[PDB]
Amino acid sequence: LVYYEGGSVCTHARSLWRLEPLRISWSGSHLRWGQPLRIRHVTTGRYL
Amino acid sequence: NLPTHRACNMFLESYKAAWILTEDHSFEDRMIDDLSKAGEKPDPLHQLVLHFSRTALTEKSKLDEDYLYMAYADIMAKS
Amino acid sequence: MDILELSERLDLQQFHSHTLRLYRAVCALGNNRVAHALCSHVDQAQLLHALEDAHLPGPLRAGYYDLLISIHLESACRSRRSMLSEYIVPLTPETRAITLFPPGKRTENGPRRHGLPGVGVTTSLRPPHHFSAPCFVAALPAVGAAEAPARLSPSIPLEALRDKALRMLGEAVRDGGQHARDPVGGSVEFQFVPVLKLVSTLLVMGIFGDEDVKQILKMIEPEVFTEGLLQMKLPESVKLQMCNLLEYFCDQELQHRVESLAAFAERYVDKLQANQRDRYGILEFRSPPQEQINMLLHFKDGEDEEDCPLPDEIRQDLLEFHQDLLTHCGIQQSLQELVSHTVVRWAQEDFVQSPELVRAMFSLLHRQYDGLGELLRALPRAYTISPSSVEDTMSLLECLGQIRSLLIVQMGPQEENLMIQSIGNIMNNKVFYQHPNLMRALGMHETVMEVMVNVLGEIRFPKMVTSCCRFLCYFCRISRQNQRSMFDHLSYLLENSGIGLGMQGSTPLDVAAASVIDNNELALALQEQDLEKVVSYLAGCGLQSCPMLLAKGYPDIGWNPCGGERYLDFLRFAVFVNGESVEENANVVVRLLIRKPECFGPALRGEGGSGLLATIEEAIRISEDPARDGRVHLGHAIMSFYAALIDLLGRCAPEMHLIQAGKGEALRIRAILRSLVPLDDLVGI
Amino acid sequence: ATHLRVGWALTEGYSPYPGGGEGWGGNGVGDDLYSYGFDGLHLWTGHVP
Amino acid sequence: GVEIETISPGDGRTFPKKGQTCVVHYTGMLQNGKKFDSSRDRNKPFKFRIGKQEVIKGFEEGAAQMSLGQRAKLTCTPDVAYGATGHPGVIPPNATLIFDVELLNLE
Amino acid sequence: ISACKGETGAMVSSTLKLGISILNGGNADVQQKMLDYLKDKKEVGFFQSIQALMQTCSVLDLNAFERQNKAKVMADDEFTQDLFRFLQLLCEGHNNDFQNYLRTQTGNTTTINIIICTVDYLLRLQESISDFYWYYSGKDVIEEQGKRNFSKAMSVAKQVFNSLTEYIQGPCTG
Amino acid sequence: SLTRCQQEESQAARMIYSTAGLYNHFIKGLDSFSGKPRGSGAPAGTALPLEGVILSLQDLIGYFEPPSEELQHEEKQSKLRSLRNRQSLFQEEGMLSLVLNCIDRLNVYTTAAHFAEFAGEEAAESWKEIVNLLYEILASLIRGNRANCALFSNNLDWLVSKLDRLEASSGILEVLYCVLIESPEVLNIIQENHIKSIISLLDKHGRNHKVLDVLCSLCVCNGVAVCSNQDLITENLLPGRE
């Protein structure tokens, strides 16, 4: 499950996400508005 | 007229209040000049400043009092 | 095997050194019984033999020196050091003879003859040491007997020990003077550190005499005090011990100055009061004696102030003494120059690494440069007493040094008994109520507060809390200055006063009440946060049932009447002073109370609560039925709560002349009070 | 206490050296199985009186 | 009880009587042969008064039977010295004690 | 100064006095070194501590004055003067860089505006002085204690005004 | 609002993900053959080689090394701060419980042959090394962090009872020493049997000064002397001169 939380959790590891564009080449390009994306949890390796 | 020990105590406090505080001293400049020599690697004043900086830079939740720092800061300020 | 063979068997050497470390560890911080037990594993002859062995490895040498110090000399040195910051001088013929300079006037040059530090007569009070002789064939004492006396400490001959220490230090100095290739212990540090540590401990404990001090001073620097040790090349570890020795000698100088000042004070007062009596006989006098002594001394400016009637010779004596005091401190070859030059040279030669050495040497330098400021700061502690009270003072000191010894130890039943006995003994002494200023200067109330803080910080020992509370109340009941000094812990006392038991006896709330009572200045300085905390406690008490009453099998009641009475009485003490009310506190209390109606109990509730008369009649009926009662009785507590509340509310009323002046605030407060309690209820009650 | 013992010894095995040894040191006549000694109260052999 | 064996003979006439004080030099070791106490190490003779429960039973009973200047050895069973509790950190429980006692002076 | 974390005491007073002693006259080298150190460290503790120290400076209190009169009004005036003198000497000499840095810290994660804090303290002091005058309007003569309180309050106000003047003396348009 | 984070935290998170996956697989593989004696099995998740966990443990050991004592003051302070932060992150994500569970699973076997009776001879060559590395990584994780050391306050018996084990005695002793040094409060729950067990360890394993240091650490609690401990040590170690 996914939650909103404050406090020391702002400095813990479970609050980190990674953004992956659907493009493979030049995946480091600046994000366009409305561009499709995937969001990944770093520590658990799961996608919302 | 009065017990001797009480009279001595009031005399001590009065003498402290009246005569001792009136006197003046000017040892600050002489002390700084002596500490700034480095005659025959930092000089002693440099080491004192570095020690106080090291004390200040430590990681702690509160700054405890340090009478040595206050006295030496007063001396430096008056110099 | 021979122990010296450990010079090549490293594993056994390491194991034995750590074994000695464990021996020291199990004896630390007042383990006198364990010291007595240890006195059978390493006896006196072994220690005295190992002190002089020149072929021992360094670690074993240091370990044996430390073991001797820890077994025999640690506790007495700790106590004496803990009681070295205060000067008490008795008015005796020996005190009168003390002078700043030696009597010889044949030398009239600038330096005159300063005199050797630490040599001369001193009269400051210091209790002696107590020891016991070890013996392992004595009959067993009463098994399990509580409140057994303290274990004292093992004994050892001291004169032979100090002679041996002096001889070893001289031998080490001679050995180091020749630049030998085989230092004792394998290095200079192992050669020098233990001997200096032992010498410093023996010096602090006060064992050496005048000749021994002269020998030590000559060893320090032969030229200044009529190859030397200060001018050799040493590492930092030796320099730390050197700094310790110099610190001891400087402390001795300061003590000598204080004692000389006290002696001159005695002589001057004795001379002056007879002249005042004669002058009054010949003939202003309505001023208090402090103002008189202030006025008599107002001639520092050097002019013949007619405001002071002092003749010429008395002023001459005072001026001569002031000049001598000024030239003694060097404001207008010696110890100060030697220390300053040595410290400056040490700082110049190399870049110091250890912070403690830097701190010590700079403290020494600061003390040396500002001679007069140190004496100025040391005076607020000095004190003089009549010679007839000496025997009474010493005992009190021996009591105080007891308590300080038990603050570094984990708490137990025997410790509790010793604390209670010591506090009772201190309370029973008479000088405790004859010299309150001395008691404040010694700062024993801080020690008792520390004991209470340690105990309180589900409590385990309830008796000590009552003992400390009653001692602090008795201390507060003595003088106004003690009351003001205790007033500064009010926030902490109120923070810890919210205990749910209360009936332990004396409680910190009593300490706070004694701190505040009948003092106009202290009452006017009260903050509103404390009152708000007390009101919150009262509301919490009025919302919940009493736990201890329920635990005893009592009928359930929705509130706690036996608890809020204490807070109500504290508020009553806070509001009413010397027969008149203070408007600010009364207004604050009323405004705080009206916003939490549950403080008034069930009777004054607006939601169906019956009036005071009905609940008083109900309580009266309750007191007639043993079934609804049952020491503490329900009806009496219910009656007392409302009686105290009505008393407080009546004391919060404004004065008559304010109503005469027509101020709106007083009329508003009186209208609120009238609306709270109807007249018919009072008439019926 | 002072040590004093008198007796007979054998050349092959009796060899005491100053310092340490069996037990608590101070080895003399009768502290091994190569000597037989007497001291006034006890017969000493094998480090046993 | 206690067993006493003579090492060096003494006077043979003078004996400790009631109300006197005995001055002795002693050395005490366990049954296994390990020394645990000695008054000669401290270089001060031990002094005690007889009949005032100052020391353990066996020491007093042994000293009561010795003459002036005699040197003897005493043995004490556990029920006489420290019983089953022992001396914490010095003597283990249920220990048999051996003493070497010399009587120097009376009163 | 940064290590005190906004707690008043003797150590901060001694530090402020030493800083004023070494900054007297508008020494440019000291200002340059301080600015370089501050911009290099990128720490936020310094200005937070300064703001916390400023928010605890006291003003004239009337109820305390009445309580004392029936028998402490402004006990920390010297510390306030030292603080504002230190700030003025920090801005002394028309040093544009330090003025701009005092208004806004560009490289830090957060920013604090000292000028507005000074204005707020000035507003509080002015309101206290107005209340004092309202109290003393009806009387015909003024007792000594009121005179000394007025004198110390105006002595503080002088330093506050001088600090503001040194803030805007560039001309620093921002 | 989007906030950038330091690369150190991302690296730590990736390492945590991989390590947690691997160790969960190892725990499941260990639990596979619990109580079923046979010559075959999968100690790892899917019978992976046991060298991988050894290499991972060695890398983790290298990761948590304390800074050199010869560095400057400020650099040492910064390195200590970074090490503390990394230890806190790893503890928060939950590796300590994983290590403890692995130790608990492996503790039921007393020797290599007894382990090979359930996992085969091909997997029994790494048992001792794995146990030693697990104790070392636990000691490295809990060192210098009193918050982490506070977790052992209620499981002192679980740590004391393992001193008898003769495969990794030094690691257990080091862990106990670190726990005793960092959290003095635990000194208030020590009882007589623990002290007697330590003294028996000294008797059984020979003359070692680490045991003496451990015994020394039990006498003083941050400035106050804890008598009982001293009395018990004196009564149990001294009188029998052996």
Coordinates of N, CA and C in Angstrom, one line a residue, chain A residues 3 7-8 14-16 18-19 24 26 40 42:
Chain A
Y3 N 1.2 5.5 1.0 CA 0.8 6.4 2.1 C 1.5 7.7 2.0
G7 N 7.8 13.6 8.8 CA 8.7 13.4 9.9 C 10.0 12.8 9.4
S8 N 10.7 12.0 10.3 CA 12.0 11.4 10.0 C 11.9 10.5 8.8
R14 N 13.1 4.2 2.4 CA 11.8 3.8 1.7 C 11.0 5.0 1.1
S15 N 11.6 6.2 1.0 CA 10.9 7.3 0.4 C 11.5 7.7 -0.9
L16 N 12.2 6.8 -1.6 CA 12.9 7.1 -2.8 C 12.3 6.4 -4.0
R18 N 12.3 6.1 -8.6 CA 13.0 6.3 -9.8 C 12.1 6.4 -11.0
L19 N 12.4 7.3 -11.9 CA 11.5 7.6 -13.0 C 12.1 7.0 -14.3
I24 N 14.0 4.0 -24.8 CA 15.2 3.3 -24.4 C 16.4 4.1 -24.8
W26 N 18.4 7.6 -25.5 CA 18.2 8.9 -25.0 C 17.2 9.0 -23.8
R40 N 9.3 3.6 -10.1 CA 9.8 2.4 -9.5 C 10.2 2.7 -8.1
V42 N 12.8 2.0 -5.3 CA 14.2 1.5 -5.4 C 14.5 0.3 -4.5

